[PDB]
Amino acid sequence: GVEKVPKYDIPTKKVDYVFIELDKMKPHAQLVQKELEAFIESVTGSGIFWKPMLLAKVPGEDMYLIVDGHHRWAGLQKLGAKRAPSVILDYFSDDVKVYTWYPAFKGDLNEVVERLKKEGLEVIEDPEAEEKAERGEIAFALVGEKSFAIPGGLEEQKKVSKVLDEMSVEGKIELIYYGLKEDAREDMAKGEIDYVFIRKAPTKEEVMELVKRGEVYSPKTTRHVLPFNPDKIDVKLEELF
Template identity: 25%
Template sequence: MSSNSWMDQLSFTITFLKISEVKPHEEIIEKNASELIKSIKKDGVQIDPVIVDKNTNVALDGMHRILALRAIDAKRIMVAKVDYFDEKIKVHRWLRAVRNFSMALLDELKVVFELKKATSQLEAMQAVDNEKSPIAILVGNVGYFSSLNATGFERFNLIREFDKRIKEYSGIMEKEIEQYLNNGFLILYVKKPEKEEVIKAGLTGTLFPPKSTRHVIPFRPVNLRCPLELLSGKFNDQEAYEILSRLIESSPKKVLPPYSIYAGRIYEEELVLYNG
């Protein structure tokens, strides 16, 4: 196998952790969690490893999987350990886009968040990115930024206040802002999270709101399909790990290129697809 093979670029270790050792950094959406619990019980497997920082066991994704496995009394969880501060791993933000909003909602947001009209949407976004404002609202061709003094994790409470006032939203990427504005959406623009904030949230339990972070993990492992009996108390740690090792070794693997669709989602990074 050549030195530049994709196998040589893998930077994760798949293993088990006690489920109590894994630290979420983000809250969950109750409806999604309930649906996942039913799905896991039906399938009888943990399909994808939860990605965790190898030094702290803070989970970078898979918050709903963690809760679902706890709900069915799993003792351990399949994880992929990575070096979170490897520069190849990126953390981005999800933005909230709201369809069919009313002018009454916009007027309410202006009051609640003490919004000031910016000279342009770019100015409103830059105010957030430069930490001069905790959030911005973009609608049509107009931008507003909040004059509230909410720094650090305090800005999370503003996102929660926003969520209380809307029925549903779409999580969108920065490159989709113009498209959604042109289609009549209202957008909540927030500061890009830092890796240090993600780790702090996991270690302190001061969690990000749901759908806040979007991680890009090069060669993300998916579809390993670990049987639930390996997560239960049926096997001791050594037995469970040996069975998992054989499962990893025997599972056929292939790499999906960036922007492939897996489980209904488009991934920016390469995926290592097991059992594909």
């Protein structure tokens, strides 16, 4: 996924890592096979693991939510490793925020709507679609020249992400994930984007409940703004087995 995000000043802080067993970490997002593959190539290439996982302790369980690190986690498991260096966050601090991403596309709206309807969704023209999506009352608003409601909740949201990645792979559309919906509207005015998909961002509380149910979001659903990026670390791959 091509990304476009606000140039956020986030400070690097020197926080120590701790090794946490991979089987104590819970994903909140579906994996992206290419990102998994790129991590595997990179870590096996250097033999240094330099970027700690960011975790949050799951209330009432001997388990951690993966805040950042899904492909590191999954890649290390696929290689046979058993742990990863991790930074434990104060996740429910006001200092940690969660937003979402806004998938936007240049291409044919009609092929996209057909394919959405092919996976059991509907796409209803609706001038209040964006207001409804922002309140969490529908799955996605689809907004460009016309405004459309896509009814539902999580299952319908995952079909939308799934259809778009299929059509991206097929090269029937160009797909950019925007950090901010207004940057997708700043660029749409310029003529670079036709349409943007708008959902209500998940809350921290919802993220944690989802993993407690053993469920996951589509890729590019959560967008965490953290109080810091951990400084880089000096851990050998051989230490993780």
